Amino acid sequence: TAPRVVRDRDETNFHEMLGKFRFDLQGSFKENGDMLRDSLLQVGRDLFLVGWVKCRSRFATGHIQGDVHALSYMRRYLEKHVDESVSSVRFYEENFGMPLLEYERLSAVNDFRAPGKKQQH
Amino acid sequence: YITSANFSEPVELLSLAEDLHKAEIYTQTTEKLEKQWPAAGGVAKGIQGDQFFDVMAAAVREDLQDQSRPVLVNELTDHENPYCMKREALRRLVLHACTRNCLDETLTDTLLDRRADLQRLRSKARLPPEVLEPLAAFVGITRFSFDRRARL
Amino acid sequence: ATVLRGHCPTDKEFIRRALEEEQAVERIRKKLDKKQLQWFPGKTPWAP
Amino acid sequence: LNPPPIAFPSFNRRCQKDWLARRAFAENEVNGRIYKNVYQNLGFKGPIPILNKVGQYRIRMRCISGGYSRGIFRFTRMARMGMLQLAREGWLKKYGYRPGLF
Amino acid sequence: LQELESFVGSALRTYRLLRPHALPFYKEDSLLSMQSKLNEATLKHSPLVHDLVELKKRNLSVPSDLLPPDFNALQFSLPVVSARGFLLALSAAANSVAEDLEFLCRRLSVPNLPHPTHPFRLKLLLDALFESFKLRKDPHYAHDWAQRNWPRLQAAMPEPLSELSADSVGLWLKAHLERVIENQRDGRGRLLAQKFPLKSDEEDLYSLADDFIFDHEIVDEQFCDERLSQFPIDKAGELFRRVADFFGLTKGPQPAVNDAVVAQFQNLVYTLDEIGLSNWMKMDTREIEEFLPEGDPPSFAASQQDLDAARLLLKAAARGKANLLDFEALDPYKLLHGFDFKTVQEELATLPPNPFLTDADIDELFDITTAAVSMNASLRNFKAKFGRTPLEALLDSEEKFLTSAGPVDWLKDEDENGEAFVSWRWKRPA
Amino acid sequence: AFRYRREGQFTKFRVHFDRSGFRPYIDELKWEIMDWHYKRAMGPQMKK
Amino acid sequence: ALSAYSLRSLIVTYNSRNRSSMNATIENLKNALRWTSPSESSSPSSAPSSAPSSAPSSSWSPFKYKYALRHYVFEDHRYAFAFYDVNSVQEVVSAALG
Amino acid sequence: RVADLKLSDSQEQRLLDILGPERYDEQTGVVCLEADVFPQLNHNAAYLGDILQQLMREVKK
Amino acid sequence: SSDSALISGAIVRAFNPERMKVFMHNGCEWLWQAEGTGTRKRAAAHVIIRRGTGQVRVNNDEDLYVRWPFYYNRMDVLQPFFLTGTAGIYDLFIHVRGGGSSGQAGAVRLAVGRALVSACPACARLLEEDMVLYEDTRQRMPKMPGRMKARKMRTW
Amino acid sequence: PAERLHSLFARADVLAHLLHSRLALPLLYPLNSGGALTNPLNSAASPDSPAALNSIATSRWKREEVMSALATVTPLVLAATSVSRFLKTAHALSYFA
Amino acid sequence: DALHPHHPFRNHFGFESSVPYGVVGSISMGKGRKKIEKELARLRYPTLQR
Amino acid sequence: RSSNPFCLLSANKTGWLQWSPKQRVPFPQPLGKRKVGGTDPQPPVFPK
Amino acid sequence: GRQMMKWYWPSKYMLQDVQMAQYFQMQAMRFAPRPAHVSLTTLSATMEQCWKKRDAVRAFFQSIDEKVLRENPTLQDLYGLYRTLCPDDPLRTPVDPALWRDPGFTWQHTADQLSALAETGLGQSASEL
RNA sequence: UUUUUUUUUUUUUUU
């Protein structure tokens, strides 16, 4: 687990680093956010996403991790290239350069609560 | 890297002057030969006539192209089709050091298709043997050879 | 002349003559194939 | 721990015995028709004891990544666990396998 | 700040609809990087590249004269056509289309003052003013409208539909408008979904795109399926011939010979399909008119080198191949190596003839001498801006993303005479 | 009536394996899966 | 007579196991056209052949009374093309295979 | 096609009788002869050409 | 009579010459020929209307009561005619392929209903009382796997 | 107007509308994500020895590109407001009773 | 008829094809055609008269 | 040895093929946390 | 017999050994030439023999009518090759109907009859050490 | 169809 202090430069290692994404969406969505979740999953597979994501009617956040260069494209896609209406984009934290990764597969957390408890809640 | 035949620099030197540089020489030679050694008409019609001056001219072109086939160093398959030699030459160079991400590796196939240079040689290849051979047997003739070299 | 962009240059009459032949061979092949289709090939009634 | 290396099955005496009968039947396949032809021409029905040990029906389905002789199909040629491991390792995608449909 | 960013995001949506058969923005960008790196790798050890280096040490720039041809241009190790040459070819080709205004408007129905002859554009301004002669706000005022337009339309019309006076037309028009409004009170998918409210437009057009529908209580069911689901493009030629004959009966002011027009009109429809013509059928052409970058007219000197270079662009583009990169005699690989490089593109590549436009007479119909040098004011809507032009803001955001792609902030180092340099710098986290 | 959504139903439950256009896949995978291990074990060893 | 023969038609069919793979072939075939010597290139007709599918069945974990099942879908794709008056055999056969 | 092939009344009837109605279509009026008794393509192709000539020898009688 | 010149002069030639045969303004106002299509369950239909007071033939030159011997089935494939008053004016031709006994009857109601609207836009509002234009795209649910032999048939 | 309509109005308009080469390409063709990488050759771009072989001027020379893009966006609006609108008129009138 | 004394007949021999044969790479690279396979490679079609 | 002129192996005149020293897209991509069988030479160990 | 054999996995103790001795031999023999010329050798050193006996074969076709030319594989080829050495040779009034022999107008016979960029590259090639 | 027929309907297809 050698840090970037060993010899990363602009020759060949400039595109050999990992990190975490930074995004926090907020605003109303069509139906219950089904369109946004489906669109994000298809694009995420092409970029070989590892982290997870959360989608809902209003709340939309998550933690996405991957390559330093791969995540750069997603920043522009999820800021202007949005078919739905977006109010504003927030940020929580970011970090570039880290040995190995935490997650292994891309998945979206969905509300699988039973319908019986929905009325009580 | 004690020896001078295994460093990163020498590998690149032989990967351009022998892979891409040699491929272009064969490509131009094949096209140039066809201009100076034309045929009576269509390639398909020339086999059904069994006429002289067509079997002879075609045979000469086959030997000239074979003698003018450079031997690739990095590639050991030794392909005979000029279209395939150029298509595969770029794949080896692109996979050496061209890409910068996982996605770029998967998009290598699309890069070759977008290039207009490779699209010109797609419609120029050898006729498969199983084109006229079945038809010849139908009429029941035992005096025709599909191969041009053997026919002469 | 009167040639469109994405269209076949061949005459329409030639296609109609050739198209009918293809439909005839397909019908004959299906009829003959169904006749020679039975379990245990080579078995015939009261043959032994 | 470490899932099995699916390319090389473990040792199994019963599994090897099934393949032994296949070779014997192939060489004796010609003799099987001769025995039926002579009886048919003469018009007499009789047994053929020699076909018991070299018969085609002696061989049955078996699992290649296994050694059990049950639960094997002609399409996959694998047991319940053989298909699960092969499909989950990422090997059937090239062969048109979409698990999305039920 | 918030309004400026919103316009940039909305503008990108219009450009996406113009590229139906193309990869997304995140796919084409990656491909360009591979092409740029491939050119450098292939041209690293070229004989020409090494020859120039040795000449500098020996203090001998040019021994006799220029070796290379005066038609090539390489930027960032990528092939690019002349920027100035494209404008001349595009303007000259599009200028001949507007020539029909003389025999359609300047001789039949003068639209007041159409423009000066050719100020800058002469392409879209003509249509904007000519189409502004038909206005309608209140149905009660429709009677007076027929008294100011009937006389002008009494020439280019069928004989049976020309004997009536202005008052006769008004009687039917007055009753027709009332029926449409009453019926407008599966019809909601083409009334509020397509119309774009502005709050500033006091009146709206009639009988243009979607105003002539809903005449009766009930409309056709299958009609809607051919506008939203998919527009039938195969019948483009059939409809055009069935409408053109109404104006031209072969015995009126129009010529008596018209047969080859239908065959050629079909090609224009197929060519526009790639641009995204099918998308405009479903969505009303309102977003493109409003949400679109704009700027000042071009201004440059037409040099002799650029004037002759534009001729080749109009030659190969007449057959359908409007791209110079796909043709030979442009690849730098064969130029720096001494391969079989020639200028036979006009005979070898241009083998397929075009027996519909012309055989060997392109400059005759398309006058290249026009515009060019003679080309050397703000619009009504373009003037109202916060200094920065709409196009300047759009490119500013795009440049900040492509240039800043990664653990990066590639900086400003020289801003003079257009030339500039870039480098690398570390980026700290927040 | 959904026509495209029900495509391939006829050749899923009312067709024989030997009387259909579907080709086997086990034959190709037999020689493909085995070769993968050969290149992995002998790959680094040959270079060393 | 052999010299009196002529290729009346050439029905070209494809069989792809993936959606993306089939789409790549269509684009590649189109690019090979619009480059022949004659003014109009050979433009074959399209004829889809549906999409056959297969999915066997198996009992589902062992030591169970058949309470659940797991299916394995194996879709397929097909495509057919038609040709008429193939004057140039080299410019058609090579393009289809390439 | 039988219609294109010019033959006498007696000869025309025998052509369809030997092959039977299975290899004859009453709609268009064409006869298809299929031969596949060999695994190889070349071997099978030559076989068809031999039987075809023999059929015409007996038809004209 | 200037109003009729603009209306009658535009229907002829020009955009769509098909709409040229009418039976006065009041009482029929129906087109000479019309077409309609209807889908219900695993079946299809194609009904065409033509002028004539003849009988009703479905296919293979047969009568109507043969396909639908039941009384309720025959009434469903003729309900729109009674409401519109075309009881004995226009002919009826029903062509179907597949389905069942009562499955094909429903497709005819949707097919014939879509034909009358095309022939007369005005004669479409009165047909909403009986819900003729309404269809049923939903189909039978699949048999779930497991122990249940049927969709929800339990066992001991 | 017989010799200026047969092959002038239905043919020449196609040439002006054939802008797919400049429209299909990306907005930033000469600049990509890897534009500041080692793509330029160090032996032919660093010392500035050559003059025509290479030219690193695509970072601030947007004036030429801005003018080129401006001329390609005006004709697009005309096609949608003249061609698409004209077709809709025939389609709508094809079902008028 | 004199082409083969062991098979006195008019037409027995055909022509050889130019179809590639053999394995691209395996333990049987140097196999080509079998002893019995070469006979049918130079004949129009196999028979059962021998 | 097929007669396809566009094939990549039909024109192979030798029994040796190049091996990629580095790969960024592993062919045997798992669908989860499961590893590839036969990729653990060293035996495991338990805390005991 | 052949259907049941297709089962189980193949043998594993018959794979090619990775021997370094055989690796060097393959590389050394990879750059071998191809001096086959099986077809060219047959045609070569044959035209001279026909030229020596040109007068002897000149009368062969005079006594043979066109209708007698039934064996084209031996006669048609001979006639075509003969005309290559002697383009002009009128034997008699009757001639081929452009079917069995197409002499054409622009044929090939035994008797025989770079740019600024490329030229500039050669001048500077052998000018640096 | 006033020298016309002489009749029940299925689970892929007229691309």
Tab-separated table of N, CA and C in Angstrom, chain A residues 4 8-10 14-15 17 22 42-43 46-47 68-69 72-77 80-85 87 93-96, chain E residues 2 5 8-9 12-13 16 25-27 29-30 37 394 397-399 401-402 404-408 410 424-427 429-430:
chain	number	residue	atom	x	y	z
A	4	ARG	N	1.156	8.014	-2.726
A	4	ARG	CA	1.582	8.729	-3.960
A	4	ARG	C	2.976	9.354	-3.871
A	8	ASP	N	4.704	9.120	-8.466
A	8	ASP	CA	3.653	9.548	-9.393
A	8	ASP	C	4.025	10.888	-10.026
A	9	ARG	N	3.870	10.985	-11.343
A	9	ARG	CA	4.165	12.188	-12.122
A	9	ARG	C	3.260	12.235	-13.343
A	10	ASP	N	3.506	13.184	-14.226
A	10	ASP	CA	2.737	13.397	-15.453
A	10	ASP	C	3.254	12.596	-16.661
A	14	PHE	N	-0.161	9.446	-14.173
A	14	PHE	CA	-1.167	10.493	-14.000
A	14	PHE	C	-2.603	9.948	-14.046
A	15	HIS	N	-2.780	8.807	-14.717
A	15	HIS	CA	-4.040	8.093	-14.884
A	15	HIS	C	-4.038	6.711	-14.253
A	17	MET	N	-4.564	6.268	-10.604
A	17	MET	CA	-4.968	6.566	-9.235
A	17	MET	C	-6.465	6.343	-9.072
A	22	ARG	N	-17.960	12.889	-5.501
A	22	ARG	CA	-18.581	13.962	-4.743
A	22	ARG	C	-19.824	14.438	-5.459
A	42	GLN	N	-27.416	2.269	-15.904
A	42	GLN	CA	-26.903	1.915	-17.226
A	42	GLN	C	-25.580	2.620	-17.517
A	43	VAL	N	-25.498	3.920	-17.226
A	43	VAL	CA	-24.254	4.665	-17.448
A	43	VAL	C	-23.155	4.208	-16.491
A	46	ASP	N	-20.961	1.161	-17.663
A	46	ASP	CA	-19.939	1.450	-18.668
A	46	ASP	C	-18.650	1.963	-18.031
A	47	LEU	N	-18.768	2.790	-17.001
A	47	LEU	CA	-17.644	3.355	-16.275
A	47	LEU	C	-17.073	2.432	-15.205
A	68	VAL	N	-9.630	7.784	-10.691
A	68	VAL	CA	-9.571	9.246	-10.615
A	68	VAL	C	-10.087	9.892	-11.901
A	69	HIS	N	-9.766	9.307	-13.059
A	69	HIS	CA	-10.164	9.865	-14.352
A	69	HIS	C	-11.586	9.479	-14.743
A	72	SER	N	-14.344	11.631	-13.255
A	72	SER	CA	-14.403	13.004	-13.754
A	72	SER	C	-15.563	13.201	-14.727
A	73	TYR	N	-15.809	12.227	-15.602
A	73	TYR	CA	-16.896	12.292	-16.566
A	73	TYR	C	-18.263	12.365	-15.908
A	74	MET	N	-18.469	11.594	-14.847
A	74	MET	CA	-19.733	11.565	-14.132
A	74	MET	C	-20.090	12.906	-13.514
A	75	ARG	N	-19.096	13.727	-13.154
A	75	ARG	CA	-19.352	15.036	-12.548
A	75	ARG	C	-20.136	15.940	-13.482
A	76	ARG	N	-19.748	15.996	-14.752
A	76	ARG	CA	-20.448	16.796	-15.754
A	76	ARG	C	-21.788	16.201	-16.143
A	77	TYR	N	-21.879	14.881	-16.202
A	77	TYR	CA	-23.115	14.203	-16.556
A	77	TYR	C	-24.231	14.478	-15.555
A	80	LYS	N	-25.292	18.920	-15.516
A	80	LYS	CA	-25.966	19.565	-16.636
A	80	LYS	C	-26.719	18.628	-17.558
A	81	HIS	N	-26.197	17.435	-17.805
A	81	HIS	CA	-26.813	16.434	-18.666
A	81	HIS	C	-27.867	15.626	-17.919
A	82	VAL	N	-28.862	16.331	-17.402
A	82	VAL	CA	-29.984	15.762	-16.668
A	82	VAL	C	-31.269	16.124	-17.375
A	83	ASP	N	-32.025	15.115	-17.799
A	83	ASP	CA	-33.299	15.370	-18.467
A	83	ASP	C	-34.322	15.991	-17.511
A	84	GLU	N	-34.347	15.528	-16.263
A	84	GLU	CA	-35.259	16.053	-15.253
A	84	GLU	C	-34.775	17.402	-14.717
A	85	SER	N	-35.618	18.049	-13.920
A	85	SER	CA	-35.286	19.329	-13.308
A	85	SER	C	-34.452	19.119	-12.051
A	87	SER	N	-32.654	21.351	-8.805
A	87	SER	CA	-32.619	22.630	-8.096
A	87	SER	C	-31.185	23.095	-7.849
A	93	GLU	N	-17.786	15.574	0.753
A	93	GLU	CA	-16.372	15.295	0.913
A	93	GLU	C	-15.844	14.516	-0.285
A	94	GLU	N	-14.551	14.625	-0.534
A	94	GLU	CA	-13.870	13.915	-1.605
A	94	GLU	C	-12.437	13.607	-1.197
A	95	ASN	N	-11.828	12.650	-1.887
A	95	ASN	CA	-10.447	12.262	-1.648
A	95	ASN	C	-9.902	11.503	-2.857
A	96	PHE	N	-8.756	11.944	-3.363
A	96	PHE	CA	-8.065	11.313	-4.481
A	96	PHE	C	-6.816	10.604	-3.995
E	2	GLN	N	-27.110	32.115	-11.025
E	2	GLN	CA	-28.025	30.994	-11.200
E	2	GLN	C	-28.638	30.985	-12.599
E	5	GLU	N	-25.969	29.870	-15.371
E	5	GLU	CA	-25.745	28.435	-15.378
E	5	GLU	C	-26.919	27.674	-15.967
E	8	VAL	N	-26.783	27.594	-19.845
E	8	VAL	CA	-25.764	26.680	-20.346
E	8	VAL	C	-26.275	25.251	-20.362
E	9	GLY	N	-26.909	24.818	-19.272
E	9	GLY	CA	-27.450	23.464	-19.208
E	9	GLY	C	-28.564	23.237	-20.227
E	12	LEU	N	-27.263	22.771	-23.986
E	12	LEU	CA	-26.714	21.464	-24.314
E	12	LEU	C	-27.792	20.478	-24.747
E	13	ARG	N	-29.013	20.618	-24.223
E	13	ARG	CA	-30.113	19.729	-24.603
E	13	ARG	C	-30.450	19.860	-26.081
E	16	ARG	N	-27.912	18.002	-28.242
E	16	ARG	CA	-28.060	16.542	-28.175
E	16	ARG	C	-29.080	16.034	-29.184
E	25	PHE	N	-21.684	12.125	-24.835
E	25	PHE	CA	-20.543	13.001	-24.619
E	25	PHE	C	-19.385	12.326	-23.894
E	26	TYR	N	-19.678	11.348	-23.045
E	26	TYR	CA	-18.679	10.629	-22.278
E	26	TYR	C	-17.975	9.532	-23.063
E	27	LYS	N	-18.447	9.226	-24.276
E	27	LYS	CA	-17.846	8.203	-25.136
E	27	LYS	C	-16.988	8.784	-26.248
E	29	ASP	N	-15.461	11.718	-26.269
E	29	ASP	CA	-14.311	12.393	-25.694
E	29	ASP	C	-13.137	11.446	-25.478
E	30	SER	N	-13.405	10.236	-25.001
E	30	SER	CA	-12.380	9.227	-24.809
E	30	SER	C	-11.732	8.796	-26.115
E	37	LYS	N	-3.074	10.471	-29.417
E	37	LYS	CA	-1.898	9.722	-29.004
E	37	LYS	C	-1.392	8.794	-30.096
E	394	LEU	N	-21.361	29.416	-23.156
E	394	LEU	CA	-21.476	27.990	-23.413
E	394	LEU	C	-20.111	27.332	-23.542
E	397	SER	N	-17.937	27.102	-20.048
E	397	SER	CA	-18.222	25.948	-19.211
E	397	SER	C	-17.639	24.665	-19.777
E	398	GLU	N	-17.763	24.455	-21.081
E	398	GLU	CA	-17.237	23.265	-21.721
E	398	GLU	C	-15.724	23.190	-21.625
E	399	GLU	N	-15.047	24.313	-21.844
E	399	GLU	CA	-13.599	24.356	-21.766
E	399	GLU	C	-13.122	24.051	-20.353
E	401	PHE	N	-14.327	22.008	-18.231
E	401	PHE	CA	-14.462	20.584	-17.939
E	401	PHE	C	-13.444	19.731	-18.690
E	402	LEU	N	-13.335	19.911	-20.011
E	402	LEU	CA	-12.399	19.122	-20.814
E	402	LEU	C	-10.958	19.397	-20.392
E	404	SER	N	-10.006	20.558	-17.405
E	404	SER	CA	-9.805	20.157	-16.004
E	404	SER	C	-10.181	18.702	-15.718
E	405	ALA	N	-10.013	17.787	-16.668
E	405	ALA	CA	-10.437	16.406	-16.474
E	405	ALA	C	-9.431	15.585	-15.639
E	406	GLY	N	-9.514	15.645	-14.304
E	406	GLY	CA	-8.792	14.730	-13.405
E	406	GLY	C	-8.154	15.384	-12.170
E	407	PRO	N	-7.019	14.848	-11.678
E	407	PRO	CA	-6.230	15.443	-10.597
E	407	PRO	C	-5.412	16.635	-11.131
E	408	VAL	N	-6.118	17.694	-11.523
E	408	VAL	CA	-5.666	18.646	-12.544
E	408	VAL	C	-6.114	20.074	-12.252
E	410	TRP	N	-4.800	22.603	-15.245
E	410	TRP	CA	-3.956	23.102	-16.341
E	410	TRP	C	-4.196	24.593	-16.611
E	424	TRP	N	0.961	21.379	-16.228
E	424	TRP	CA	0.314	20.643	-15.154
E	424	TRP	C	0.533	21.330	-13.810
E	425	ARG	N	-0.378	21.081	-12.875
E	425	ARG	CA	-0.295	21.590	-11.512
E	425	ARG	C	-1.109	20.696	-10.586
E	426	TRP	N	-0.629	20.532	-9.359
E	426	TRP	CA	-1.346	19.779	-8.342
E	426	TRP	C	-2.645	20.463	-7.930
E	427	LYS	N	-3.618	19.655	-7.513
E	427	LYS	CA	-4.910	20.118	-7.014
E	427	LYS	C	-5.126	19.625	-5.595
E	429	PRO	N	-7.594	19.026	-2.172
E	429	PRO	CA	-8.988	18.738	-1.891
E	429	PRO	C	-9.625	19.841	-1.040
E	430	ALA	N	-10.948	19.803	-0.933
E	430	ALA	CA	-11.701	20.743	-0.110
E	430	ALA	C	-11.733	20.310	1.360
